[PDB]
Amino acid sequence: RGSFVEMVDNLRGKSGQGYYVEMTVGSPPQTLNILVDTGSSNFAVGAAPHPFLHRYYQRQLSSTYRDLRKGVYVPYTQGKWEGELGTDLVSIPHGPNVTVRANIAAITESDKFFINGSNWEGILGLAYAEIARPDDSLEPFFDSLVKQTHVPNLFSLQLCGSVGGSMIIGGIDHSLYTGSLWYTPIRREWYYEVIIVRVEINGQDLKMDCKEYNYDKSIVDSGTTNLRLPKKVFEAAVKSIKAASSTEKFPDGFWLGEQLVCWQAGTTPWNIFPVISLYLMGEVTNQSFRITILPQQYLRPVDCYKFAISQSSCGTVMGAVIMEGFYVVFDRARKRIGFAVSACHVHDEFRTAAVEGPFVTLDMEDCGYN
Numbered sequence: 452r453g454s455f456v457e458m459v460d461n462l463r464g465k466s467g468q469g470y471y472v473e474m475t476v477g478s479p480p481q482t483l484n485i486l487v488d489t490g491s492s493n494f495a496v497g498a499a500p501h502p503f504l505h506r507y508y509q510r511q512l513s514s515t516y517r518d519l520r521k522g523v524y525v526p527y528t529q530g531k532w533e534g535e536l537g538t539d540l541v542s543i544p545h546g547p548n549v550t551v552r553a554n555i556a557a558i559t560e561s562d563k564f565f566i567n568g569s570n571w572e573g574i575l576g577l578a579y580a581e582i583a584r585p586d587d588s589l590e591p592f593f594d595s596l597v598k599q600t601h602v603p604n605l606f607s608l609q610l611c612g613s614v615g616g617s618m619i620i621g622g623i624d625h626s627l628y629t630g631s632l633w634y635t636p637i638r639r640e641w642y643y644e645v646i647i648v649r650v651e652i653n654g655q656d657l658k659m660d661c662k663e664y665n666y667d668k669s670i671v672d673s674g675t676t677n678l679r680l681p682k683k684v685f686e687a688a689v690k691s692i693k694a695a696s697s698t699e700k701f702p703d704g705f706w707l708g709e710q711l712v713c714w715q716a717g718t719t720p721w722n723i724f725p726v727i728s729l730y731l732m733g734e735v736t737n738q739s740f741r742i743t744i745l746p747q748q749y750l751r752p753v754d755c756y757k758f759a760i761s762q763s764s765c766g767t768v769m770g771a772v773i774m775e776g777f778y779v780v781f782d783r784a785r786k787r788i789g790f791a792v793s794a795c796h797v798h799d800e801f802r803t804a805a806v807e808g809p810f811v812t813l814d815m816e817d818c819g820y821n
């Protein structure tokens with residue numbers, strides 16, 4: 452409790468391609484690299500020789516595999532993945548020293564799911580059963596882990612922007628953050644849903660209705676790269692970012708993500724870009740705290756940079772942009788999410804990412820969409 456040296460630096464990845472952990476499935480253990488995703492609830496792995504894959508789940512080689520005789524089809528905006536459901540012995544080599552029987556979706560057909568040149572072969576859905584496919588009766592991995600072992604109902608993520616990080620399963624590592632942890636309530640157990648109560652652009656309020664910041668929902672999602680903002684909020688935020696950075700010239704398609712902006716090595720103007728503070732609902736009535744991100748977080752290197760704030764039709768998504776500045780504690784036991792300044796985040800001598808509180812905010816319940 453507090454250390455967990457085995458789990459430090461157990462995450463790897465490429466910028467914009469997500470963070471993956473090493474896992475084993477079946478017996479004898481079949482090693483796979485698995486994308487860590489707090490925005491979904493299915494443990495799904497490649498099970499067929501797709502050309503993009505380094506390796507895949509071979510059920511015939513596993514003596515402990517049990518077929519569920521059920522299929523799962525998961526469509527989305529770009530493509531899909533389809534798989535066959537079963538259960539097997541699942542373990543995390545650089546995690547807790549345990550082995551559990553968990554549900555595995557063996558992917559047999561996919562479109563625009565696997566990435567050409569990537570080093571991961573599956574996805575670990577760490578969200579709740581409510582958004583699991585085909586339905587809520589299929590138990591997610593972490594629910595199975597807690598139920599079958601003495602591992603506490605908690606995990607934390609330190610994502611550092613080759614890219615790396617740490618997933619601490621069953622606890623918190625105090626070396627991975629500086630200062631204090633600040634907790635925001637999980638509004639509902641489906642996605643990791645939170646409530647944003649105020650937004651500042653360089654210490655300046657957007658003066659919008661706080662219900663707009665959570666239009667539909669607001670979520671913490673390690674599977675999304677960008678900081679996704681509601682259309683009305685995005686429009687207001689970019690306008691304030693445009694005005695704050697008027698010293699340098701940028702094309703119109705850049706803010707929409709249709710074009711990149713490039714600068715000479717070491718000549719990237721950070722100071723011209725504003726900081727972004729998100730005020731989150733606190734644990735106490737009328738009490739809030741704020742998390743502040745640097746341009747280092749929302750300007751993602753592709754020195755060519757992409758604008759990593761995008762308009763969304765599904766609510767606020769606090770992706771890797773937000774998460775890379777902070778140590779994030781998914782305290783499932785107490786239905787809350789902790790934020791603290793990451794010990795590994797990208798910062799300069801001028802400005803640093805911050806978690807500050809407490810603040811006074813009234814009518815925070817009105818910010819949640821119904």
Ligand SMILES: COc1cccc(OC)c1CN1CCC(NC(=O)CCCS)CC1
Nearest residue numbers: 469488490491527563564674675765766768
């Ligand atoms: C199965 O989905 C895919 C498909 C291709 C790549 C991929 O890995 C980045 C995933 C995994 N992951 C699922 C959950 C998704 N998150 C959301 O639905 C919230 C945003 C809407 S407001 C993010 C993507």
